[PDB]
Design a protein around this ligand. Sequence first.
Ligand SMILES: [Mn+2]
Ligand SMILES: [Mn+2]
Ligand SMILES: [Mn+2]
Ligand SMILES: [Mn+2]
Ligand SMILES: [Mn+2]
Ligand SMILES: [Mn+2]
Lengths: 214, 210
Amino acid sequence: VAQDYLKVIWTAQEWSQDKVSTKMLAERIGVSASTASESIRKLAEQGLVDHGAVTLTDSGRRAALAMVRRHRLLETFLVNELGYRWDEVHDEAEVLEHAVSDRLMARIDAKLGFPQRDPHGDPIPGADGQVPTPPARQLWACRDGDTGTVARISDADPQMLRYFASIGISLDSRLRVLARREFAGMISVAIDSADGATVDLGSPAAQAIWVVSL
Amino acid sequence: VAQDYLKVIWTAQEWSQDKVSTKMLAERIGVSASTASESIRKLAEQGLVDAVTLTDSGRRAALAMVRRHRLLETFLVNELGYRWDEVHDEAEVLEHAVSDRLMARIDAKLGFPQRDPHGDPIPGADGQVPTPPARQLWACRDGDTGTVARISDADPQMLRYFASIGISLDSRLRVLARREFAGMISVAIDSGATVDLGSPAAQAIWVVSL
Ligand SMILES: [Mn+2]
Ligand SMILES: [Mn+2]
Ligand SMILES: [Mn+2]
Ligand SMILES: [Mn+2]
Ligand SMILES: [Mn+2]
Ligand SMILES: [Mn+2]
């Protein structure tokens, strides 16, 4: 699916500045690298990408921003109107993104009150194409003593979203790092809650929580 | 394609007994008579269909596609401000990229509806079709009564027209000629105005006596 590639390339560049090899595309889009190379070759001919490493052109940016907007407004609509949880929305909107007309997103956007962020805090690009990215970094990238408000949680693993909800790490929850033990991949944080509990996040969980220091 | 096929065979035999030929699928869906048979063969190679006529496992798959389409048509009008003449072509597209979990929550949010915005019966999850006992208005005689049950959606021009005069599901109609020479029938609507409908218009209005 050609549209999946532009959205994936853009989401990879959203919180990192590395490279998106054709092998990175294949394993996350979900198809063999044999066809991903044959795929990514096509979009470069259409003037959408360029590639070694792959990048977005200007026609690919406005096209990927469109795909991201539909995906993320659909996730939001499934939670706020249809009763999904935040771990059930990504697989649904991953399929619904290629069958929706601009008219439907307009009424979805209008009924949702024009939301700017996901159930995961993922920024929803505007129709004009601005993108409201919050100024955040991963919890694992922080150091001892730092505080912050959870602003965005990755949805690559629905189990991890389930784990976060069970202990009390939601969007807008305030954390402080107590003991970051780089060896061996453990970080202790204090959730600012009513009874004020304390949890021990492993290295992968902390690399999924983006936080805003304020 | 291939779910659009099965859906069309069932919807064709829903209000008539005229049967389906490989070409008539090509004029409804949109393809050549050549490819039309090749798309039919793989539904027949699966045991979903054997003058098309579907089998038990084929009726079940078509009833699920019909249910998805009409639940979408209802969700669009009731939740997202669509008019009944805008939903078909859009719901014609969503029906292939929707999960059964999403349909169930749409179904539950709509209150478990039996009819869609056009009065078309919405099949149950197990294939329990709630067919209403209706006949074409053009088949009535002056002067029977009857509530409108189903209105055809093959043309959004007709639905847009019906809504303009005041014709919509549940409205009671009374026939007062009944003028074939004139190619139209006059009806009283109570809910008291007088409206004249041509033969093609009254042919897209199924009604339930008294
Ligand atoms: Mn997502
Ligand atoms: Mn997708
Ligand atoms: Mn998201
Ligand atoms: Mn329809
Ligand atoms: Mn269809
Ligand atoms: Mn309908």
